Structures are given as C-alpha cells and as structure tokens.
Design an enzyme around this catalytic site. Structure first.
Site, PDB file in Angstrom:
ATOM      1  N   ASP A 186     -11.908 -10.143  -1.866  1.00  0.00           N
ATOM      2  CA  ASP A 186     -13.589 -10.234  -1.551  1.00  0.00           C
ATOM      3  C   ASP A 186     -14.519  -9.286  -2.292  1.00  0.00           C
ATOM      4  O   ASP A 186     -13.308  -8.775  -3.314  1.00  0.00           O
ATOM      5  CB  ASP A 186     -13.333 -10.453  -0.597  1.00  0.00           C
ATOM      6  CG  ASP A 186     -12.695  -9.471   0.341  1.00  0.00           C
ATOM      7  OD1 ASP A 186     -12.372  -7.637  -0.326  1.00  0.00           O
ATOM      8  OD2 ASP A 186     -12.222  -9.043   1.732  1.00  0.00           O
ATOM      9  N   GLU A 220       0.823  -0.873  -0.466  1.00  0.00           N
ATOM     10  CA  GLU A 220       0.052   0.004   0.138  1.00  0.00           C
ATOM     11  C   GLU A 220       1.135   0.981   0.277  1.00  0.00           C
ATOM     12  O   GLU A 220       0.473   2.086   0.715  1.00  0.00           O
ATOM     13  CB  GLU A 220      -1.444   0.186   1.532  1.00  0.00           C
ATOM     14  CG  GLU A 220      -2.245  -1.131   0.985  1.00  0.00           C
ATOM     15  CD  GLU A 220      -3.530  -1.396   2.230  1.00  0.00           C
ATOM     16  OE1 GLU A 220      -3.043  -0.136   2.582  1.00  0.00           O
ATOM     17  OE2 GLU A 220      -3.483  -2.181   1.684  1.00  0.00           O
ATOM     18  N   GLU A 236      -5.841 -10.879  -1.744  1.00  0.00           N
ATOM     19  CA  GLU A 236      -6.986 -10.574  -0.941  1.00  0.00           C
ATOM     20  C   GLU A 236      -8.066 -10.501  -1.024  1.00  0.00           C
ATOM     21  O   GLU A 236      -9.338  -9.784  -0.964  1.00  0.00           O
ATOM     22  CB  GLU A 236      -6.691  -9.464   0.527  1.00  0.00           C
ATOM     23  CG  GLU A 236      -4.951  -9.080   0.391  1.00  0.00           C
ATOM     24  CD  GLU A 236      -4.610  -8.006   0.754  1.00  0.00           C
ATOM     25  OE1 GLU A 236      -5.690  -7.026   1.394  1.00  0.00           O
ATOM     26  OE2 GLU A 236      -3.354  -8.000   1.640  1.00  0.00           O
ATOM     27  N   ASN A 247       2.371  -5.253  -3.003  1.00  0.00           N
ATOM     28  CA  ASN A 247       0.642  -5.931  -3.019  1.00  0.00           C
ATOM     29  C   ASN A 247      -0.089  -4.055  -2.707  1.00  0.00           C
ATOM     30  O   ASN A 247       0.555  -3.802  -2.377  1.00  0.00           O
ATOM     31  CB  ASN A 247       1.108  -6.411  -1.616  1.00  0.00           C
ATOM     32  CG  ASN A 247      -0.240  -7.101  -1.772  1.00  0.00           C
ATOM     33  OD1 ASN A 247      -0.767  -7.722  -2.420  1.00  0.00           O
ATOM     34  ND2 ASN A 247      -1.510  -6.935  -0.376  1.00  0.00           N
ATOM     35  N   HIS A 286     -10.048  -6.474  -2.985  1.00  0.00           N
ATOM     36  CA  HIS A 286     -10.888  -5.925  -2.541  1.00  0.00           C
ATOM     37  C   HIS A 286     -11.736  -5.020  -3.421  1.00  0.00           C
ATOM     38  O   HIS A 286     -12.009  -3.876  -3.538  1.00  0.00           O
ATOM     39  CB  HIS A 286     -10.750  -4.861  -1.109  1.00  0.00           C
ATOM     40  CG  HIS A 286      -9.795  -5.935  -1.057  1.00  0.00           C
ATOM     41  ND1 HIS A 286      -9.775  -7.038   0.325  1.00  0.00           N
ATOM     42  CD2 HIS A 286      -8.084  -5.731   0.208  1.00  0.00           C
ATOM     43  CE1 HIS A 286      -8.790  -7.247   0.417  1.00  0.00           C
ATOM     44  NE2 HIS A 286      -8.147  -6.638   0.805  1.00  0.00           N
TER      45      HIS A 286
HETATM   46  O1  LIG Z   1      -8.416  -8.913  10.419  1.00  0.00           O
HETATM   47  C1  LIG Z   1      -8.274  -7.687  10.123  1.00  0.00           C
HETATM   48  C2  LIG Z   1      -7.242  -8.693   8.482  1.00  0.00           C
HETATM   49  O2  LIG Z   1      -8.310  -8.822   7.913  1.00  0.00           O
HETATM   50  C3  LIG Z   1      -7.096  -7.062   7.945  1.00  0.00           C
HETATM   51  O3  LIG Z   1      -5.923  -7.469   6.081  1.00  0.00           O
HETATM   52  C4  LIG Z   1      -6.132  -6.114   6.042  1.00  0.00           C
HETATM   53  C5  LIG Z   1      -7.599  -5.906   4.781  1.00  0.00           C
HETATM   54  O4  LIG Z   1      -6.744  -4.937   3.877  1.00  0.00           O
HETATM   55  C6  LIG Z   1      -6.177  -5.049   3.066  1.00  0.00           C
HETATM   56  O5  LIG Z   1      -5.388  -3.716   2.349  1.00  0.00           O
HETATM   57  C7  LIG Z   1      -4.315  -5.357   3.938  1.00  0.00           C
HETATM   58  O6  LIG Z   1      -3.217  -6.107   2.915  1.00  0.00           O
HETATM   59  C8  LIG Z   1      -5.294  -6.668   5.167  1.00  0.00           C
HETATM   60  O7  LIG Z   1      -4.251  -6.988   5.349  1.00  0.00           O
HETATM   61  O8  LIG Z   1      -6.338  -5.951   8.486  1.00  0.00           O
HETATM   62  C9  LIG Z   1      -7.243  -5.604   9.673  1.00  0.00           C
HETATM   63  C10 LIG Z   1      -7.320  -6.197  11.107  1.00  0.00           C
HETATM   64  O9  LIG Z   1      -8.468  -6.281  11.421  1.00  0.00           O
HETATM   65  O1  LIG Z   2      -7.048  -1.325   5.130  1.00  0.00           O
HETATM   66  C1  LIG Z   2      -7.176  -0.676   3.701  1.00  0.00           C
HETATM   67  C2  LIG Z   2      -8.775  -0.004   3.009  1.00  0.00           C
HETATM   68  O2  LIG Z   2      -8.101   1.552   3.609  1.00  0.00           O
HETATM   69  C3  LIG Z   2      -8.478  -0.076   1.797  1.00  0.00           C
HETATM   70  O3  LIG Z   2     -10.284   0.230   0.827  1.00  0.00           O
HETATM   71  C4  LIG Z   2     -10.321   0.036  -0.585  1.00  0.00           C
HETATM   72  C5  LIG Z   2     -10.725   1.850  -0.599  1.00  0.00           C
HETATM   73  O4  LIG Z   2     -10.928   1.597  -2.278  1.00  0.00           O
HETATM   74  C6  LIG Z   2     -11.856   0.527  -2.396  1.00  0.00           C
HETATM   75  O5  LIG Z   2     -13.560   0.721  -2.121  1.00  0.00           O
HETATM   76  C7  LIG Z   2     -11.474  -0.939  -2.540  1.00  0.00           C
HETATM   77  O6  LIG Z   2     -12.511  -1.668  -2.423  1.00  0.00           O
HETATM   78  C8  LIG Z   2     -11.081  -0.467  -1.133  1.00  0.00           C
HETATM   79  O7  LIG Z   2     -11.333  -2.239  -0.185  1.00  0.00           O
HETATM   80  O8  LIG Z   2      -8.679  -1.412   1.345  1.00  0.00           O
HETATM   81  C9  LIG Z   2      -7.480  -2.465   1.642  1.00  0.00           C
HETATM   82  C10 LIG Z   2      -6.992  -1.958   2.931  1.00  0.00           C
HETATM   83  O9  LIG Z   2      -5.758  -2.355   2.594  1.00  0.00           O
END
Ligand SMILES: O[C@@H]1[C@@H](O)[C@H](O[C@@H]2CO[C@@H](O)[C@H](O)[C@H]2O)OC[C@H]1O
Ligand SMILES: O[C@@H]1[C@@H](O)[C@H](O[C@@H]2CO[C@H](O)[C@H](O)[C@H]2O)OC[C@H]1O
Ligand code: NAG
Length: 319
Positions: free
Chosen positions: A240, A131, A238, A172, A208
C-alpha cells in the site's frame, strides 16, 4: 484483462489482495474481490492471527479464517496464510504468562502445529514469523525473543515444515524493501534459519510505502535480488502507498508512478512470485487509523472506482 492476468503473463504466480471478514458482507466489494482478472490470491487480514486462532491455550478457533479460505476456494484463488509468530495481536494468555523457555516453546510449537495442520494443503505460503527485527537490524524484544532467544525463529520454521512439508515458508517484515541495516538483518535471518537446518522458502516484503517517498525501482530490485541470491523466492505481501492527506491530482499521479515501480521491480527479478495489496479499496484500508493524517493508499478509491495507481500497476506489469 487485469492485474492478475497481467502478472501471470510476466511469469508471476499471482496478483492478489488481503481482505477481512466484515467486508465479505458487502456484495459490491465481494464482486470485485472475486474478479480473477484482478485477483488470483487472497490473504486474511486478521482471522489467521494468534488472537483469532488460539484465544485460549490449546483452544483453537478457525471459523473466521475458514470463511476467507472458502471465498478463495469459491473463486479458484490461491491463499497466503498470515501469520503464526508475531508480537502483535497476541491473546492475553501469551502476553501475560509467566514463561520459561521450555513452557513458551511448547505453547509456540503447539500453536504452529495446530494452525499449520488445520490449513494443510490450503495455503500457497505461510508468514511463519512476522516483524522479528528492529530498524537497526537487532532482534525485536517480543515475548518470544525475551524468553527463547534467537532460536525461536528457526524453531518456528522447523515446526511449520514438520506440519506441512509442501507449503512455502516465509519470513515477513516491513522496511526490508530498501537497502539498509534492516534488510541486511533479514538476509541474515534467512542465513540463520538455514544454518540451524530449518527450511525457509521465501522472504515477504510488506511494502507499506509513502507517496513521494517510495523506494526507487533500482533499489527495490537490488534488494529483491539480494534475497533471491540466497536461494529463496520473494514476494511483496502487504503493498500500500499511503499519502499525506488531502488527496490531490498531483498526489494521485505520484502514487501511480510509485506503484508502477514496485510492480516493475518484481517483474525484473526472477524469483519474485507475486504482489499482494493490503486490501484493494481505500474504504477498508488500515492506514488512516494508524498513521494520523495519511490515507488513500490503494488502487481503488472508497467508492470502488479505479485510481491512477491501477494504471501504474498495469504499466509496471508491462500491460
Ligand atoms: O485490520 C488491521 C490489519 O489490516 C493490520 O494488518 C497488519 C498491518 O501491518 C502489517 O505489518 C501486519 O503484518 C499486518 O497483519 O493489523 C491490524 C488490524 O487492525
Ligand atoms: O503493525 C506495524 C506498524 O507499526 C508498521 O509501520 C512502519 C514504520 O516505518 C514506516 O513508515 C513504514 O512505512 C510503516 O509501515 O508498519 C507495519 C505494521 O506491521
Ligand atoms: C530454548 O531451548 C531450545 C532447546 O530446546 C534452545 O534452542 C534455545 O536456545 C533456548 N533458549 C534459551 C534462552 O535458553
């Protein structure tokens, strides 16, 4: 027979899932996590982050991370290790320090060396930096970027490569899966690492996504090929696909087609080595606590029952 068998049949290395330590005491959860028809690879969701692994300076803590590696080893699953340098889930000592370039560099390098050496031989890949970008493609103003500048990224890669020369080193990020400034910037990070002379093997695309707003298979694939053209591999790390609640039959069907296209994009790109979903049951998703009003993001529901998305992934894998 399942997602991982289907994935390997198409030349991917794995289909996998993240998990976290509190879930390993749920015997029904563990049974399905351990089903290698569906999961050939495991990522720790939290126990390899900096706050977990280096809670005090030069004081390392590996028990929780090693518990996840032990479960993967029991099952013959590959591991992705996650994550070394990231602005989130830092311990207080990092975020509150009065640093110079030299003192924070020494702390960062020492973190990387120690954690990568600890898990030497045990990881398919590391997410070395997570990130690093803003949405416009500029660099995120983390402590590392504020104090060290852009060089923190290749220095991190080079430090990890010295500690474990065999493991795949990934950059990543999220919102780098669709065409735009951020994805271009991520291509530029690959280029910058190599211009410094440091090793980078892969680009990790978090994936995501949102139901009904998921990038299309064509755009996903154009972006994947934009990274594999650079001489790196790619993976969805990751995945979802969160829905605006409540769940409905229509939204579940749409979520299936969204997951279908992600799997099909990876199969269609030589150099896409795999897909990891960010946990596998809605019971344990991170989503609802972060994205208010959204949830039900995964291919199994909160009662461990397959959703239509499972069949969408199988169909995208050509199974
Ligand atoms: O349990 C939570 C984790 O699932 C979460 O994992 C992060 C989700 O956002 C991604 O962008 C990250 O790379 C990933 O590690 O982190 C927060 C925690 O509470
Ligand atoms: O921990 C961070 C979150 O803030 C982050 O959010 C993004 C923002 O843009 C989107 O809508 C995308 O779908 C989200 O996942 O998501 C990843 C996580 O590292
Ligand atoms: C920190 O030092 C390294 C040399 O060790 C250098 O690559 C980097 O650019 C420096 N950053 C700043 C902001 O001085």
């Amino acid at each position: 027979a399942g997602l991982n068998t289907a994935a390997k049949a198409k030349g991917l290395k794995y289909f996998g899932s993240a998990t976290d330590n509190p879930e390993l005491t749920d015997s029904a959860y563990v049974a399905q996590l351990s089903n290698t028809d569906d999961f050939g690879q495991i990522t720790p969701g939290n126990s390899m982050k900096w706050d977990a692994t280096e809670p005090s300076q030069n004081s390392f803590s590996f028990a929780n991370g090693d518990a996840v590696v032990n479960l993967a080893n029991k099952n013959g699953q590959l591991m992705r290790c996650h994550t070394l340098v990231w602005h989130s889930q830092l311990p207080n000592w990092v975020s509150s320090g009065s640093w110079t370039n030299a003192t924070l560099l020494a702390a960062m390098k020492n973190h990387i060396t120690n954690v990568v050496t600890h898990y030497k031989g045990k990881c398919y890949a590391w997410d070395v930096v997570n990130e690093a970008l803003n949405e416009d493609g500029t660099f995120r103003n983390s402590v590392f970027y504020q104090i060290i500048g852009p060089a923190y990224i290749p220095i991190a890669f080079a430090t990890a490569a010295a500690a474990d020369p065999d493991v795949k080193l990934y950059y990543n990020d999220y919102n780098i899966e669709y065409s735009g400034a951020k994805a271009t910037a991520a291509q530029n990070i690959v280029k910058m690492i190599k211009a410094y002379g440091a090793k980078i093997d892969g680009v990790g695309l978090q994936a995501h996504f949102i139901v009904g707003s998921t990038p299309s298979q064509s755009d996903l694939t154009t972006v994947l090929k934009g990274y594999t053209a650079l001489g790196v591999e790619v993976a969805y790390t990751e995945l979802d696909i969160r829905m605006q609640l409540p769940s409905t039959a229509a939204k579940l069907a749409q979520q299936s087609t969204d997951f279908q296209g992600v799997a099909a994009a990876c199969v269609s790109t030589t150099g896409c080595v795999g897909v990891t979903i960010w946990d596998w049951t809605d019971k344990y998703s991170w989503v609802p606590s972060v994205f208010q009003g959204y949830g039900a993001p995964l291919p199994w529901d909160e009662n461990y029952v397959k959703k239509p998305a499972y069949d969408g992934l199988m169909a995208g894998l050509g199974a």
